[PDB]
Ligand SMILES: CC(=O)SCCNC(=O)CCNC(=O)[C@H](O)C(C)(C)COP(=O)(O)OP(=O)(O)OC[C@H]1O[C@@H](n2cnc3c(N)ncnc32)[C@H](O)[C@@H]1OP(=O)(O)O
């Protein structure tokens with residue numbers, strides 16, 4: 001019923017809009033299993049008008065936002081209340097966002113999509129699958145037994161920049177500045193895995209009060225398949241539990257779901273899974 005429809009276009013979300021968006025997020029999560037990446041901490045800050053809110057009678061039923069991370073693409077999050085899907089809401093929101101993307105002269109759009117939900121018809125429309133991002137959690141208080149490999153583990157320091165940059169150069173090709181900034185945030189640590197005296201991998205740890213989060217996990221391609229990734233992740237799990245945390249979270253990017261079996265074996269369960277699909281503007 002169009003009388004009650006309205007689209008609000010904003011530079012940031014006030015506290016009520018954030019509450020509304022979190023309610024919408026929750027109802028999509030229950031229907032879909034996973035949700036797009038919304039970067040709530042970015043929406044809360046004033047930016048210089050990339051959030052588009054669809055209300056029906058003042059109830060938030062649709063949301064789209066644009067995120068200028070890349071220098072030659074833009075990330076797009078779109079969510080529509082399950083009650084109101086297939087009525088053109090997502091298409092209305094994308095149309096509102098396009099002028100702003102064109103004006104910035106970006107031409108490539110990258111959408112984060114709940115795992116498995118849309119693959120059939122994203123393919124039809126010409127989207128290209130890029131990779132997936134999985135957020136997992138291990139809520140077991142028991143440490144991981146075994147998984148011992150001939151590795152030593154070191155906490156990285158500002159002196160390990162060559163080692164860290166070398167690892168990233170092979171896995172995931174200004175890394176000096178990024179590792180310096182990470183190593184200067186007291187919530188972060190990086191564990192380096194050594195085989196004899198050659199660095200062969202690393203994992204980042206972000207510490208919070210009740211949990212810690214593993215990310216940016218790398219094992220050199222030529223050293224994979226020897227148990228080293230499992231040994232490093234087990235080392236990290238046990239380090240986190242020995243500080244008294246009750247949860248280990250994990251953020252991993254993969255092009256293939258089978259790479260996830262390692263983490264399932266170590267007791268992780270998926271809490272959120274997104275697939276990233278790109279498309280050029282003129283479509
Ligand atoms: C292009 C994107 O928006 S990727 C968004 C990924 N986000 C999510 O998946 C979050 C959970 N899912 C949702 O919120 C919704 O299902 C969305 C955002 C994917 C689509 O929202 P809707 O308002 O229902 O989409 P809308 O009704 O505007 O349809 C837009 C187009 O996509 C098509 N479409 C939408 N959903 C589907 C679907 N499940 N299956 C097949 N086609 C679909 C429509 O046929 C339409 O095509 P058309 O322009 O040729 O007529």
Ligand SMILES: CC(C)(COP(=O)(O)OP(=O)(O)OC[C@H]1O[C@@H](n2cnc3c(N)ncnc32)[C@H](O)[C@@H]1OP(=O)(O)O)[C@@H](O)C(=O)NCCC(=O)NCCS
Pocket residue numbers: 147170171172217218219220221223224225226227228229230231252253254258259260261262263265
């Ligand atoms: C960490 C990662 C790279 C794998 O590293 P790895 O050293 O090859 O991992 P492992 O050798 O420990 O494990 C490989 C397999 O052997 C199993 N394994 C490890 N130790 C084992 C042990 N004692 N007993 C039985 N199985 C074991 C693992 O469960 C794993 O499962 P799979 O065969 O079903 O796939 C991968 O899991 C990943 O996360 N990829 C996405 C992130 C990424 O690609 N970063 C860039 C790397 S270049």
